[PDB]
Motif scaffolding. Structure first.
Motif: not given
Lengths: 49, 145, 393, 48
Positions: C359-379
């Motif tokens: 679900v991290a890899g689920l989050a990771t790919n999700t952090l990419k596509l909608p979240e492109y806003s350039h945020s500091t995030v740690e998976v």
């Protein structure tokens, strides 16, 4: 085979549905046999081809 | 052997009680002529104590004690066969192999199985050879002789 | 995380080291041994084939650890023990917002809010496993007329509304049953159950719609799932499980640890006890204990609130069986709440050891596509990233 | 040991009875705490 043939005779007579018989060479005097036998009796029920 | 199947049952984790029918010899001390059965199987009462002592053995193994009475085989008892009628004249019962087999299965019935789960079951399958006043010094030896 | 990534000897290394892990496992293993006559430790440590339990007989050609009545129990204990260790090191933050995917949600509530005993958790979860086996019709061979399939809407120009459309059409057209079971990732992961022919016809559609498909792209059929669960077919067996929950989940619990921190499945939006929230539940899941509470909210007297939260929590878990799990919205919701509450640094940690990469890899790919806003995030993953979790480096 | 001294007595031909005091354990079966004595010495009745 004279002992082996007997259990086959005994099974083919008294066997009902759901009935499965197992015949094995065994020595109760050997601790190795006891350990090895039940290690056989208790493992899987699986046949790998 | 009991310990071995207890390990398997515990390791592979079953609460199922293995019912071990202990082939006790009939009525120790009132026969002097057997020479083998009578003495050896009296420690089965001590073995029932081991299960009554050891706590974790209950779920894995239940002890069903059966005293196997006079039972006529051809090979070993081929001498004893003729006096089977003689011993039976005392108002006592000697058993065929099929009769004794039936007595052993009845201990394997659902009714007596649950009884073994609650507590060790000691069954006398003997034909009344216990209160026997027959002298073994004669009626056994002479039979054998 | 949910079921299916479970491995033999999972989190068994932690059990040998951490004291908190042992207490979780042993208290759990003792209960299971006494009541049901079996040990979860043995199942996890070495994978057997057949097992006979109290009233039931479970046989698998591969492993029992991969059987749901066990698998769910193993997964739940693995994660519950890992969090307990994280809590012992104090690494658990006081404001952490928690959620779970399917069976993982029960562990989520267990770890963060302590909504049940360690033995209580493995009861519900075990029975929930045994409940999942008898729900759907089978053949003589144990065949099913249904199945599940994993969709990736990407690689072509297609949207979530486009997937929903195409599925809804072929559902009405053929007259067969086709349901979107799981909303997992925005433009990435979707799960669909229903008639096998419907799964085939849906497979066929995207192969025709996508101009580049020679290999049947974007569609993965799920092995092993014979039940069209999380569809409209499963709503019958809830009432029995709804009572089972209330038995193992009593009324003395922490309201705050759940509220705002917990995101149900049936309800994609964060747990809060309000007339607004309880209504959203009823709309998605019509229910008798809920519809009355909505009818009179004038019960305002202070004896109610905990008692209200206690039933609402159970309602969400009981009907989680029926309603589709929304992971998309769960992820997106986190963004919604942050954005309104400030966007500053966030850390996303997955627990349950080897289930953590998923679900991290689920989050990771999700952090990419909608979240492109350039945020500091740690998976971060319990399995992979452990050095980062305990901060040791 | 009993058999051994029986041979000597028979070979060297004495009618003298060797009195062997058998160190029986007290009252078998009514104690569960000894763990050793109680069980082992009950076969002395069988030895008699």
């Amino acid at each position: 085979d004279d002992r082996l043939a007997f259990y086959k005779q005994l099974y083919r007579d008294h066997a009902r549905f759901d009935a499965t018989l197992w015949v094995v060479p065994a020595n109760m005097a050997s601790y190795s046999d006891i350990d090895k036998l039940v290690e056989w009796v208790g493992t899987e029920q699986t046949e790998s081809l | 052997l009991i310990s071995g199947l207890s390990k398997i049952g515990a390791e592979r984790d079953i609460a199922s009680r293995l019912h071990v029918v202990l082939p006790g010899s009939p009525n120790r001390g009132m026969f002097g002529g057997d020479g083998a059965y009578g003495e050896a199987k009296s420690a089965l009462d001590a073995l029932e104590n081991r299960w009554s002592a050891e706590k974790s053995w209950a779920e894995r193994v239940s002890l069903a004690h059966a005293l196997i009475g006079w039972t006529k085989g051809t090979g070993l008892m081929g001498q004893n066969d003729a006096i089977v009628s003689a011993v039976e004249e005392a108002g006592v019962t000697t058993y065929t192999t099929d009769e004794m087999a039936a007595m052993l299965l009845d201990l394997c019935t659902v009714e007596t199985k649950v009884a073994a789960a609650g507590a060790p079951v000691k069954v006398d399958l003997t034909g009344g050879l216990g209160d026997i006043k027959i002298d073994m010094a004669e009626l056994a030896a002479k039979a054998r002789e | 995380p949910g079921q299916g990534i479970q491995h033999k000897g999972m989190g068994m290394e932690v059990r040998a080291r951490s004291k908190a892990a042992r207490k979780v496992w042993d208290s759990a293993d003792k209960f299971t041994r006494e009541t049901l006559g079996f040990s979860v430790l043995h199942v996890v440590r070495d994978n057997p084939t057949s097992l006979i339990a109290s009233g039931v007989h479970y046989h698998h050609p591969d492993g029992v650890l991969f059987l749901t009545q066990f698998t769910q129990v193993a997964m739940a204990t693995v994660a519950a023990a890992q969090v307990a260790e994280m809590r012992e090191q104090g690494a658990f933050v006081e404001g952490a917002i928690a959620c779970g995917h399917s069976v993982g949600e029960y562990t989520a509530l267990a770890c963060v809010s302590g909504v049940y005993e360690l033995e209580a958790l493995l009861e519900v979860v075990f029975h929930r496993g045994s409940k999942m086996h008898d729900i759907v019709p089978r053949d003589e061979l144990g065949r099913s007329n249904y199945r599940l399939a994993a969709i990736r809407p990407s690689q072509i120009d297609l949207d979530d509304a486009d997937v929903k459309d195409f599925v809804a059409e072929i559902s009405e057209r053929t007259g067969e049953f086709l349901e979107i079971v799981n909303f997992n990732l925005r433009g990435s992961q979707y799960a669909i159950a229903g008639t096998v022919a419907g799964l085939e016809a849906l497979e066929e559609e995207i192969e025709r719609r996508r101009q580049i498909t020679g290999g049947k792209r974007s569609f993965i059929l799920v092995p092993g799932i014979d039940v069209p669960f999380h569809s409209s077919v499963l709503r019958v067996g809830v009432a029995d499980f709804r009572r089972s929950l209330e038995r193992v989940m009593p009324r003395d619990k922490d309201p705050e640890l759940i509220i705002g921190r917990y995101i149900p499945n049936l309800v994609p939006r964060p747990f809060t006890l309000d007339r607004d929230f309880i209504q959203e539940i009823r709309d998605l899941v019509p229910a008798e204990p809920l519809d009355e509470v909505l009818a009179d909210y004038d019960t305002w007297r202070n004896e109610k609130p905990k008692e209200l939260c206690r039933k609402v929590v159970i309602e969400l878990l009981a009907w989680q069986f029926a309603s589709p799990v929304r992971w998309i919205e769960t992820q997106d919701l986190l963004f919604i709440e942050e954005a309104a509450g400030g966007l500053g640094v966030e850390r996303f940690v997955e627990i349950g050891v080897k289930s953590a990469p998923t679900v991290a890899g689920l989050a990771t790919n999700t952090l990419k596509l909608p979240e492109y806003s350039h945020s500091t995030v740690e998976v971060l993953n319990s399995e992979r990233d452990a050095a980062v979790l305990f901060a040791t480096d």
